Amino acid sequence: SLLNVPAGKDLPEDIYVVIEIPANADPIKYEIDKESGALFVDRFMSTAMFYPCNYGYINHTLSLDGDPVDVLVPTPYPLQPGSVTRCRPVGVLKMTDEAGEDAKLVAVPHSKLSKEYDHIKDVNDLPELLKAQIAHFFEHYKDLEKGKWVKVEGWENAEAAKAEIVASFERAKNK
Amino acid sequence: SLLNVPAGKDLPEDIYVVIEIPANADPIKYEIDKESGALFVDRFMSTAMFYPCNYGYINHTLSLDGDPVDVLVPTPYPLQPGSVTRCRPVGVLKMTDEAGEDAKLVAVPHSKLSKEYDHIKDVNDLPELLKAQIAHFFEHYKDLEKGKWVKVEGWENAEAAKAEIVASFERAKNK
Amino acid sequence: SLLNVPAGKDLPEDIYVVIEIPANADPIKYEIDKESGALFVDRFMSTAMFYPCNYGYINHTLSLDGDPVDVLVPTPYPLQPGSVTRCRPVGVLKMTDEAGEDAKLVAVPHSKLSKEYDHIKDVNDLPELLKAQIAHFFEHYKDLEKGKWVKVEGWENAEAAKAEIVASFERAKNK
Amino acid sequence: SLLNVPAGKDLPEDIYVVIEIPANADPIKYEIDKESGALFVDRFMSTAMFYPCNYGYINHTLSLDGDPVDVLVPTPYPLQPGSVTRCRPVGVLKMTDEAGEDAKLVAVPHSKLSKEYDHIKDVNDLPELLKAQIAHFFEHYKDLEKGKWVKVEGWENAEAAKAEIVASFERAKNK
Amino acid sequence: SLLNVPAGKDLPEDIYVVIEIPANADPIKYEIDKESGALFVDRFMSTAMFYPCNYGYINHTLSLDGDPVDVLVPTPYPLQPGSVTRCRPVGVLKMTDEAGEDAKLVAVPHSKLSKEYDHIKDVNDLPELLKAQIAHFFEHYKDLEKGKWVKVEGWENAEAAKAEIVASFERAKNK
Amino acid sequence: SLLNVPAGKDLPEDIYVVIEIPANADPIKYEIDKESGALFVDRFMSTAMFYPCNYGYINHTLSLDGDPVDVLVPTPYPLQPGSVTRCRPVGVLKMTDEAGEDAKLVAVPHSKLSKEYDHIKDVNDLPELLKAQIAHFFEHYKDLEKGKWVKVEGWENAEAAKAEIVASFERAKNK
Ligand SMILES: [Ca+2]
Ligand SMILES: [Ca+2]
Ligand SMILES: [Ca+2]
Ligand SMILES: [Ca+2]
Ligand SMILES: [Ca+2]
Ligand SMILES: [Ca+2]
Ligand SMILES: [Ca+2]
Ligand SMILES: [Ca+2]
Ligand SMILES: [Ca+2]
Ligand SMILES: [Ca+2]
Ligand SMILES: [Ca+2]
Ligand SMILES: [Ca+2]
Ligand SMILES: [Ca+2]
Ligand SMILES: [Ca+2]
Ligand SMILES: [Ca+2]
Ligand SMILES: [Ca+2]
Ligand SMILES: [Ca+2]
Ligand SMILES: [Ca+2]
Ligand SMILES: [Ca+2]
Ligand SMILES: [Ca+2]
Ligand SMILES: [Ca+2]
Ligand SMILES: [Ca+2]
Ligand SMILES: [Ca+2]
Ligand SMILES: [Ca+2]
Ligand SMILES: [Cl-]
Ligand SMILES: [Cl-]
Ligand SMILES: [Cl-]
Ligand SMILES: [Cl-]
Ligand SMILES: [Cl-]
Ligand SMILES: [Cl-]
Ligand SMILES: [Cl-]
Ligand SMILES: [Cl-]
Ligand SMILES: [Cl-]
Ligand SMILES: [Cl-]
Ligand SMILES: [Cl-]
Ligand SMILES: [Cl-]
Ligand SMILES: [Cl-]
Ligand SMILES: [Cl-]
Ligand SMILES: [Cl-]
Ligand SMILES: [Cl-]
Ligand SMILES: [Cl-]
Ligand SMILES: [Cl-]
Ligand code: NA
Ligand code: NA
Ligand code: NA
Ligand code: NA
Ligand code: NA
Ligand code: NA
């Protein structure tokens, strides 16, 4: 199942991301159920917004919210929910939501999948529009849902992203 | 796998539905294979019709046709085949087909997924057009397939739907 | 999982094909990972081309490239990645790529799924345009990827396709 | 505008069809307004059905219902509403609806657009499934609309189709 | 052309709306050019948002921003840009943007197109979620565009909507 | 109509492009008919290829093939056939086809539509993958059509593109 996919070939540089939500999709918030490996509908989002990138997680990690760490993956074409993409972390958007600190990593397709993102080595190489769109999305996507909310704290670099990967990988290792 | 998803958090009021066919999709009749949990193509439907709602089943139930009980789930946006949605039963369309009585439950997204359907408490709260579309779909979707056919028997309420859930859950329990 | 799906009800005449890529889709080359059964992104294809048919494989087979044997399945509407379709082999396009001989079977939906393809009994019954499109696709889809390439060797009949099925089924049987 | 498009290069053998509704589309019944040439929504159809082919009309014709003659055009991929396709008539489905006799021509893409349909010379060469789907569609698409209804009278050949073209062209000529 | 479409059969009760942007579409802000009647790209919107309803205007009106009055039209399925739908006004969202007061009417499909919206007689009958989504959309869709901004002032009823229609119709009449 | 759209606000720097074919679309080759301004189907393309960018023309120009000059426009999301986008030329792919020299301009969305392409000032700033995809597309898209063919001659800069615009604008001016 999706439950059995590694965190990565060589974390934190070389990771796999399980996709839950495609870029530019209908506002259905899918989440993989850890017990079954199945894709569940968490909610029908209430704002008229879409994820700027594919959205998913790194398996065999545990963030402080109790779920695997959250990752955005830009691609040339939207990915299928439940698919897995090999990627390389390049930055992280720090934020707190209704449950606490819950960072949003950005990882680009690995060179072996495409050469398109090889020039993106660190967070400053991400397009400014994309970064602003991501920040705006997380600032506002919960605006019409009672008891959900976000404080966006700012962009940090690839080293920071990799530290978060390692930390949440080690957290799951000793659960 | 999808094989391991509960029938519900608290049946029959609070159920999970495994989706096989999205609303308003191409006429591919997918079915989950009970042995593998994989999505198989049962047939390419022959009429130029689409399911008015997402279509799927409640796991760990057994109807008289030998399959898990059939459920229609209206949503704001079509769901992915193989995904699972938490729902609440609100009515049932009774019918017989070429194999016998094989009712079609209607269950709406659970309040925790959306508030949109909370006002739908019983079958009379479903839109009349939607109910008529569902009835017409099942009356006609087999019209061009030899040895497939339907007799639609009528709409019944949420209590009737819940009774069917319990009955087919208990049937699977002792198989 | 998809790992547990038979090669066929009655190979080589009656087979199942696990779909990885839909017909006429975005240029994402998905592949099922044999370890996990999950759909991985192999690459983002570099040419502006699409598969003329759904593309996938027969489980529990092993071709000389180390993967299960490759199958194209024409359908009236594109199939979902990760779904399984019952089919009947009708021809094969022989070719060598950067790793060696790696034939592309064509199998049509089984009569039980549709009557649409029953008249296609052998390779000469496939539409000429479709065959030419398939040949052209494999001749060119790697043209912009370094270290990937193809030599198309020609169309052969249904008996040849069935021989390839049996051979790669027997190869996996003794791995 | 679309108002100024010829009926055909060489009617009735060589015609243009203005497309109003794509094949396999959402149930929005678009119609070109004769005054403005704009695409208007006639209605949101009430049954869960789709047109088996693109649907439109031959400009500068007048059928007995007061509109230009109705044409179905099968294509490999759905056409855009408001686009124009060169075609060749091959058959006609005779029927009466709530307003009277209102035949449905079938015309295939002209050889200059594609070779795919050149083998379809007359109504017997159309696929049987497609013809049955068209007949079933018109028999049922008005089933949930009060004061709309259909009596399907049967398939006739290409000569009959061409006669209808000429007759409605001549009708518009002297309005 | 679209330039020649009436404001309505019987304004302000019975209007036509020219659609520029479909509901739930990609973030391309199309606008009809008054000179040519063609659909121009005004901009590629910068936030990750979509219009909750189809969006367009009433022809032969002039609002204070210099364009025809703006209308949102909910439908069961998204409409084609450049198409025209007969509708009935039911409410208005008052707001000011970077150019001044520029209200957003809501008009539902006319009864002759569908019975689905007949129960919506006034603004209080619109779903609360939809109204909140519309308000949130206009509050935020310009958030990442320099020199574009919005102050949302509040919902008013069908009479207010009709007054705005009449006022901008009369404004265009004497330009 | 589309017939009445200017070549540009300030040619050759500031142009309008009428879109005929969206990026990444089905293989329907639409063309605007100069007489009617309507979108006609020229052909159903025979290779399994798609245009890497939106494709269209500059109105009120005449190239040596007798049609207005051909332009590719990259956008974040595909454009609607028949829509018009303001753009800025940045390069040109020179080639000859079955009718003669028939260059393919590349023009990016004008700064007023988006800031995304402002950094693309000349042909060397276009992504290498995109340029290679465009070249490969034109080298191969006619490979399965008798009496259609292409010789790609190479990329030239923005000044060359602008010269071609001016030349074909002046050609149409004196027809
Ligand atoms: Ca989308
Ligand atoms: Ca998450
Ligand atoms: Ca969270
Ligand atoms: Ca999280
Ligand atoms: Ca659909
Ligand atoms: Ca079932
Ligand atoms: Ca049944
Ligand atoms: Ca059943
Ligand atoms: Ca496609
Ligand atoms: Ca393979
Ligand atoms: Ca290979
Ligand atoms: Ca292979
Ligand atoms: Ca469709
Ligand atoms: Ca008609
Ligand atoms: Ca009629
Ligand atoms: Ca008619
Ligand atoms: Ca959309
Ligand atoms: Ca406007
Ligand atoms: Ca405004
Ligand atoms: Ca306005
Ligand atoms: Ca596409
Ligand atoms: Ca051209
Ligand atoms: Ca040419
Ligand atoms: Ca040309
Ligand atoms: Cl791991
Ligand atoms: Cl993306
Ligand atoms: Cl990498
Ligand atoms: Cl259970
Ligand atoms: Cl639904
Ligand atoms: Cl509930
Ligand atoms: Cl097996
Ligand atoms: Cl196919
Ligand atoms: Cl068979
Ligand atoms: Cl004419
Ligand atoms: Cl069609
Ligand atoms: Cl012809
Ligand atoms: Cl008027
Ligand atoms: Cl809508
Ligand atoms: Cl009304
Ligand atoms: Cl001009
Ligand atoms: Cl593009
Ligand atoms: Cl510019
Ligand atoms: Na909130
Ligand atoms: Na039947
Ligand atoms: Na290569
Ligand atoms: Na009726
Ligand atoms: Na702003
Ligand atoms: Na050729």
Side-chain angles (χ1 to χ4, degrees):
Chain A
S1 189
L2 283 169
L3 298 198
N4 268 206
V5 171
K9 185 165 197 131
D10 187 7
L11 303 100
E13 323 99 77
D14 185 354
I15 63 167
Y16 293 120
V17 175
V18 181
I19 302 303
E20 292 170 318
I21 306 172
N24 197 31
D26 293 344
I28 306 161
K29 209 291 180 184
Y30 293 108
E31 297 183 343
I32 295 292
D33 174 47
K34 56 149 240 115
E35 275 295 276
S36 58
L39 203 67
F40 282 58
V41 178
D42 181 70
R43 68 191 182 270
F44 299 97
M45 289 191 18
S46 291
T47 58
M49 307 191 79
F50 62 81
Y51 286 78
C53 304
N54 314 101
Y55 186 69
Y57 66 91
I58 308 172
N59 201 32
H60 297 134
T61 68
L62 183 62
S63 77
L64 292 160
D65 73 347
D67 283 349
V69 324
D70 302 323
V71 189
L72 295 150
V73 182
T75 62
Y77 301 97
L79 297 182
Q80 173 176 141
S83 67
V84 183
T85 300
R86 192 184 182 182
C87 297
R88 177 177 45 86
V90 299
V92 55
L93 182 60
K94 303 291 263 234
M95 66 184 64
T96 45
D97 70 9
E98 70 274 354
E101 173 67 44
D102 193 30
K104 302 291 176 265
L105 282 63
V106 180
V108 296
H110 193 274
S111 53
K112 299 259 210 296
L113 275 56
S114 188
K115 306 175 44 219
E116 180 167 356
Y117 299 89
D118 290 346
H119 71 283
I120 305 180
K121 307 292 202 184
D122 206 343
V123 65
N124 292 335
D125 301 324
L126 289 164
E128 295 307 305
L129 171 63
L130 183 65
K131 285 182 298 188
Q133 289 174 330
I134 292 166
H136 180 266
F137 174 88
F138 288 104
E139 281 158 12
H140 294 290
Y141 77 127
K142 285 175 164 174
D143 282 348
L144 299 177
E145 282 158 71
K146 197 194 337 81
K148 303 191 175 299
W149 56 258
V150 177
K151 169 118 88 159
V152 171
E153 295 159 342
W155 288 99
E156 301 179 357
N157 69 13
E159 270 288 286
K162 292 177 198 133
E164 176 61 32
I165 294 167
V166 166
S168 288
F169 184 72
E170 301 276 321
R171 190 178 288 115
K173 193 134 145 227
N174 24 258
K175 323 257 177 259
Chain B
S1 189
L2 283 170
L3 298 198
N4 268 206
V5 171
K9 185 165 197 131
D10 187 7
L11 303 100
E13 323 99 77
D14 185 354
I15 63 167
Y16 293 120
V17 175
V18 181
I19 302 303
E20 292 170 318
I21 306 172
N24 197 31
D26 293 344
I28 306 161
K29 209 291 180 184
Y30 293 108
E31 297 183 343
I32 295 292
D33 174 47
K34 56 149 240 115
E35 275 295 276
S36 58
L39 203 67
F40 282 58
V41 178
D42 181 70
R43 68 191 182 270
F44 299 97
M45 289 191 18
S46 291
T47 58
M49 307 191 79
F50 62 81
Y51 286 78
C53 304
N54 314 101
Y55 186 69
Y57 66 91
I58 308 172
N59 201 32
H60 297 134
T61 68
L62 183 62
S63 77
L64 292 160
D65 73 347
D67 283 349
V69 324
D70 302 323
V71 189
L72 295 150
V73 182
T75 62
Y77 301 97
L79 297 182
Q80 173 176 141
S83 67
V84 183
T85 300
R86 192 184 182 182
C87 297
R88 177 177 45 86
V90 299
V92 55
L93 182 60
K94 303 291 263 234
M95 66 184 64
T96 45
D97 70 9
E98 70 274 354
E101 173 67 44
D102 193 30
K104 302 291 176 265
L105 282 63
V106 180
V108 296
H110 193 274
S111 53
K112 299 259 210 296
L113 275 56
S114 188
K115 306 175 44 219
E116 180 167 356
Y117 299 89
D118 290 346
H119 71 283
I120 305 180
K121 307 292 202 184
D122 206 343
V123 65
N124 292 335
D125 301 324
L126 289 164
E128 295 307 305
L129 171 63
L130 183 65
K131 285 182 298 188
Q133 289 174 330
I134 292 166
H136 180 266
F137 174 88
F138 288 104
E139 281 158 12
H140 294 290
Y141 77 127
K142 285 175 164 174
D143 282 348
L144 299 177
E145 282 158 71
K146 197 194 337 81
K148 303 191 175 299
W149 56 258
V150 177
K151 169 118 88 159
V152 171
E153 295 159 342
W155 288 99
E156 301 179 357
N157 69 13
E159 270 288 286
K162 292 177 198 133
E164 176 61 32
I165 294 167
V166 166
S168 288
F169 184 72
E170 301 276 321
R171 190 178 288 115
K173 193 134 145 227
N174 24 258
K175 323 257 177 259
Chain C
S1 189
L2 283 170
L3 298 198
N4 268 206
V5 171
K9 185 165 197 131
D10 187 7
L11 303 100
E13 323 99 77
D14 185 354
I15 63 167
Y16 293 120
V17 175
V18 181
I19 302 303
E20 292 170 318
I21 306 172
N24 197 31
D26 293 344
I28 306 161
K29 209 291 180 184
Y30 293 108
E31 297 183 343
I32 295 292
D33 174 47
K34 56 149 240 115
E35 275 295 276
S36 58
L39 203 67
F40 282 58
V41 178
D42 181 70
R43 68 191 182 270
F44 299 97
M45 289 191 18
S46 291
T47 58
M49 307 191 79
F50 62 81
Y51 286 78
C53 304
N54 314 101
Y55 186 69
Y57 66 91
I58 308 172
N59 201 32
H60 297 134
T61 68
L62 183 62
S63 77
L64 292 160
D65 73 347
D67 283 349
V69 324
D70 302 323
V71 189
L72 295 150
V73 182
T75 62
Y77 301 97
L79 297 182
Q80 173 176 141
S83 67
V84 183
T85 300
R86 192 184 182 182
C87 297
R88 177 177 45 86
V90 299
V92 55
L93 182 60
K94 303 291 263 234
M95 66 184 64
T96 45
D97 70 9
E98 70 274 354
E101 173 67 44
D102 193 30
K104 302 291 176 265
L105 282 63
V106 180
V108 296
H110 193 274
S111 53
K112 299 259 210 296
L113 275 56
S114 188
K115 306 175 44 219
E116 180 167 356
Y117 299 89
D118 290 346
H119 71 283
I120 305 180
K121 307 292 202 184
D122 206 343
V123 65
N124 292 335
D125 301 324
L126 289 164
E128 295 307 305
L129 171 63
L130 183 65
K131 285 182 298 188
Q133 289 174 330
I134 292 166
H136 180 266
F137 174 88
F138 288 104
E139 281 158 12
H140 294 290
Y141 77 127
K142 285 175 164 174
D143 282 348
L144 299 177
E145 282 158 71
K146 197 194 337 81
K148 303 191 175 299
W149 56 258
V150 177
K151 169 118 88 159
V152 171
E153 295 159 342
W155 288 99
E156 301 179 357
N157 69 13
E159 270 288 286
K162 292 177 198 133
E164 176 61 32
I165 294 167
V166 166
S168 288
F169 184 72
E170 301 276 321
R171 190 178 288 115
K173 193 134 145 227
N174 24 258
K175 323 257 177 259
Chain D
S1 189
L2 283 169
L3 298 198
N4 268 206
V5 171
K9 185 165 197 131
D10 187 7
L11 303 100
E13 323 99 77
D14 185 354
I15 63 167
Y16 293 120
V17 175
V18 181
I19 302 303
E20 292 170 318
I21 306 172
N24 197 31
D26 293 344
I28 306 161
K29 209 291 180 184
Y30 293 108
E31 297 183 343
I32 295 292
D33 174 47
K34 56 149 240 115
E35 275 295 276
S36 58
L39 203 67
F40 282 58
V41 178
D42 181 70
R43 68 191 182 270
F44 299 97
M45 289 191 18
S46 291
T47 58
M49 307 191 79
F50 62 81
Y51 286 78
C53 304
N54 314 101
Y55 186 69
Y57 66 91
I58 308 172
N59 201 32
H60 297 134
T61 68
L62 183 62
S63 77
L64 292 160
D65 73 347
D67 283 349
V69 324
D70 302 323
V71 189
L72 295 150
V73 182
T75 62
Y77 301 97
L79 297 182
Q80 173 176 141
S83 67
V84 183
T85 300
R86 192 184 182 182
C87 297
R88 177 177 45 86
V90 299
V92 55
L93 182 60
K94 303 291 263 234
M95 66 184 64
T96 45
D97 70 9
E98 70 274 354
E101 173 67 44
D102 193 30
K104 302 291 176 265
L105 282 63
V106 180
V108 296
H110 193 274
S111 53
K112 299 259 210 296
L113 275 56
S114 188
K115 306 175 44 219
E116 180 167 356
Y117 299 89
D118 290 346
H119 71 283
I120 305 180
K121 307 292 202 184
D122 206 343
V123 65
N124 292 335
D125 301 324
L126 289 164
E128 295 307 305
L129 171 63
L130 183 65
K131 285 182 298 188
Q133 289 174 330
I134 292 166
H136 180 266
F137 174 88
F138 288 104
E139 281 158 12
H140 294 290
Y141 77 127
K142 285 175 164 174
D143 282 348
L144 299 177
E145 282 158 71
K146 197 194 337 81
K148 303 191 175 299
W149 56 258
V150 177
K151 169 118 88 159
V152 171
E153 295 159 342
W155 288 99
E156 301 179 357
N157 69 13
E159 270 288 286
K162 292 177 198 133
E164 176 61 32
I165 294 167
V166 166
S168 288
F169 184 72
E170 301 276 321
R171 190 178 288 115
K173 193 134 145 227
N174 24 258
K175 323 257 177 259
Chain E
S1 189
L2 283 170
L3 298 198
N4 268 206
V5 171
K9 185 165 197 131
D10 187 7
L11 303 100
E13 323 99 77
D14 185 354
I15 63 167
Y16 293 120
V17 175
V18 181
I19 302 303
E20 292 170 318
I21 306 172
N24 197 31
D26 293 344
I28 306 161
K29 209 291 180 184
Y30 293 108
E31 297 183 343
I32 295 292
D33 174 47
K34 56 149 240 115
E35 275 295 276
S36 58
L39 203 67
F40 282 58
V41 178
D42 181 70
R43 68 191 182 270
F44 299 97
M45 289 191 18
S46 291
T47 58
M49 307 191 79
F50 62 81
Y51 286 78
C53 304
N54 314 101
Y55 186 69
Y57 66 91
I58 308 172
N59 201 32
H60 297 134
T61 68
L62 183 62
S63 77
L64 292 160
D65 73 347
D67 283 349
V69 324
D70 302 323
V71 189
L72 295 150
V73 182
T75 62
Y77 301 97
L79 297 182
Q80 173 176 141
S83 67
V84 183
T85 300
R86 192 184 182 182
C87 297
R88 177 177 45 86
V90 299
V92 55
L93 182 60
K94 303 291 263 234
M95 66 184 64
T96 45
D97 70 9
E98 70 274 354
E101 173 67 44
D102 193 30
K104 302 291 176 265
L105 282 63
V106 180
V108 296
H110 193 274
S111 53
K112 299 259 210 296
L113 275 56
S114 188
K115 306 175 44 219
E116 180 167 356
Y117 299 89
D118 290 346
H119 71 283
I120 305 180
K121 307 292 202 184
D122 206 343
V123 65
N124 292 335
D125 301 324
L126 289 164
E128 295 307 305
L129 171 63
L130 183 65
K131 285 182 298 188
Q133 289 174 330
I134 292 166
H136 180 266
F137 174 88
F138 288 104
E139 281 158 12
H140 294 290
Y141 77 127
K142 285 175 164 174
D143 282 348
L144 299 177
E145 282 158 71
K146 197 194 337 81
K148 303 191 175 299
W149 56 258
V150 177
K151 169 118 88 159
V152 171
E153 295 159 342
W155 288 99
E156 301 179 357
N157 69 13
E159 270 288 286
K162 292 177 198 133
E164 176 61 32
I165 294 167
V166 166
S168 288
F169 184 72
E170 301 276 321
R171 190 178 288 115
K173 193 134 145 227
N174 24 258
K175 323 257 177 259
Chain F
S1 189
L2 283 170
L3 298 198
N4 268 206
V5 171
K9 185 165 197 131
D10 187 7
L11 303 100
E13 323 99 77
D14 185 354
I15 63 167
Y16 293 120
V17 175
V18 181
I19 302 303
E20 292 170 318
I21 306 172
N24 197 31
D26 293 344
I28 306 161
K29 209 291 180 184
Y30 293 108
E31 297 183 343
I32 295 292
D33 174 47
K34 56 149 240 115
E35 275 295 276
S36 59
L39 203 67
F40 282 58
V41 178
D42 181 70
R43 68 191 182 270
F44 299 97
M45 289 191 18
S46 291
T47 58
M49 307 191 79
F50 62 81
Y51 286 78
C53 304
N54 314 101
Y55 186 69
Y57 66 91
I58 308 172
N59 201 32
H60 297 134
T61 68
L62 183 62
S63 77
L64 292 160
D65 73 347
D67 283 349
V69 324
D70 302 323
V71 189
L72 295 150
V73 182
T75 62
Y77 301 97
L79 297 182
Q80 173 176 141
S83 67
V84 183
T85 300
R86 192 184 182 182
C87 297
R88 177 177 45 86
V90 299
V92 55
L93 182 60
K94 303 291 263 234
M95 66 184 64
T96 45
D97 70 9
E98 70 274 354
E101 173 67 44
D102 193 30
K104 302 291 176 265
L105 282 63
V106 180
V108 296
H110 193 274
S111 53
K112 299 259 210 296
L113 275 56
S114 188
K115 306 175 44 219
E116 180 167 356
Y117 299 89
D118 290 346
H119 71 283
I120 305 180
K121 307 292 202 184
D122 206 343
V123 65
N124 292 335
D125 301 324
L126 289 164
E128 295 307 305
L129 171 63
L130 183 65
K131 285 182 298 188
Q133 289 174 330
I134 292 166
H136 180 266
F137 174 88
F138 288 104
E139 281 158 12
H140 294 290
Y141 77 127
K142 285 175 164 174
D143 282 348
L144 299 177
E145 282 158 71
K146 197 194 337 81
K148 303 191 175 299
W149 56 258
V150 177
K151 169 118 88 159
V152 171
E153 295 159 342
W155 288 99
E156 301 179 357
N157 69 13
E159 270 288 286
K162 292 177 198 133
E164 176 61 32
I165 294 167
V166 166
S168 288
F169 184 72
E170 301 276 321
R171 190 178 288 115
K173 193 134 145 227
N174 24 258
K175 323 257 177 259

